[PDB]
Amino acid sequence: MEPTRDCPLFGGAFSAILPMGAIDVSDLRPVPDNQEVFCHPVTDQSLIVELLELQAHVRGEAAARYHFEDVGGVQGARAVHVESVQPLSLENLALRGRCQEAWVLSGKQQIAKENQQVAKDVTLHQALLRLPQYQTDLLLTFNQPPPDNRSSLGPENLSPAPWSLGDFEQLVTSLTLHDPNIFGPQ
């Protein structure tokens, strides 16, 4: 079964898909409408969506690395590698409204603490999206545990299973444009 629930955003300008389980942390802390931070208790995952403006001319694969260095470079993270990148074409847009382009860059960094002795690898799945509506750059952030479960391979016939790209792909499609309420004077 592949359900879908478009949640009203900005009065109905953007439609975000994400069934039960994904709750906004805005109730726990202040979060401007420009961005959205959802979380899943079942898998203990984290989903963040922040809106940005096209700076100079950094978009696509370049936008990913450019913004990556600003995230994994300005805030800790001393050792970061690159696993691969998946190009997001127009077909990737569920509603398939109007999308100039889209790219995906996955990887992990070594975020050291004040002690600079401890280390923890966190799988970061980000997707760079750019729209010509007004030179925008939507950033996506996915936090998941790195694939290296030794000895125990996780529950087999008990508790929920770990989310995969299937969920990430759905989050990217969470920007379906049905009613262009944010096109005119809005």
Side-chain angles (χ1 to χ4, degrees):
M1 202 98 213
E2 280 194 318
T4 174
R5 48 152 82 161
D6 290 282
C7 312
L9 237 92
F10 289 94
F14 269 89
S15 272
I17 310 126
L18 54 143
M20 213 167 226
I23 185 183
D24 217 52
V25 278
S26 217
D27 202 62
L28 210 56
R29 54 181 249 279
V31 187
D33 214 60
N34 211 33
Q35 50 152 126
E36 226 75 85
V37 191
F38 276 89
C39 180
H40 314 115
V42 290
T43 351
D44 264 88
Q45 251 57 284
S46 284
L47 266 52
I48 310 141
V49 188
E50 210 201 331
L51 244 74
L52 302 89
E53 264 240 75
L54 229 92
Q55 182 61 44
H57 48 89
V58 193
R59 328 161 236 85
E61 190 173 86
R65 270 150 198 80
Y66 182 66
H67 280 294
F68 193 101
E69 284 262 64
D70 201 66
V71 187
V74 185
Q75 288 142 115
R78 283 169 158 199
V80 65
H81 79 341
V82 285
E83 65 188 73
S84 237
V85 293
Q86 223 255 253
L88 246 54
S89 52
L90 226 161
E91 208 162 37
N92 279 256
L93 284 306
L95 231 289
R96 233 179 311 156
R98 316 95 203 198
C99 262
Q100 244 246 231
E101 251 278 54
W103 290 76
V104 188
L105 187 151
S106 314
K108 302 114 135 95
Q109 47 279 304
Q110 171 187 241
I111 186 284
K113 216 133 75 127
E114 311 218 286
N115 226 60
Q116 268 110 78
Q117 221 74 303
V118 295
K120 267 199 288 286
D121 269 282
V122 186
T123 309
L124 248 177
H125 232 101
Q126 59 234 110
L128 254 295
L129 308 146
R130 42 84 121 265
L131 308 89
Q133 238 299 98
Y134 60 94
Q135 307 288 258
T136 185
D137 258 306
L138 268 103
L139 233 90
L140 278 68
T141 337
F142 266 68
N143 296 324
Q144 48 211 236
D148 194 50
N149 286 104
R150 306 293 256 281
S151 249
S152 264
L153 278 296
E156 198 163 50
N157 301 124
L158 54 124
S159 90
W163 255 310
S164 79
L165 240 177
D167 217 46
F168 184 73
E169 289 227 57
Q170 196 55 65
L171 207 290
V172 186
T173 39
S174 303
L175 260 69
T176 56
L177 181 50
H178 311 254
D179 295 296
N181 248 235
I182 190 100
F183 275 58
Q186 304 227 227

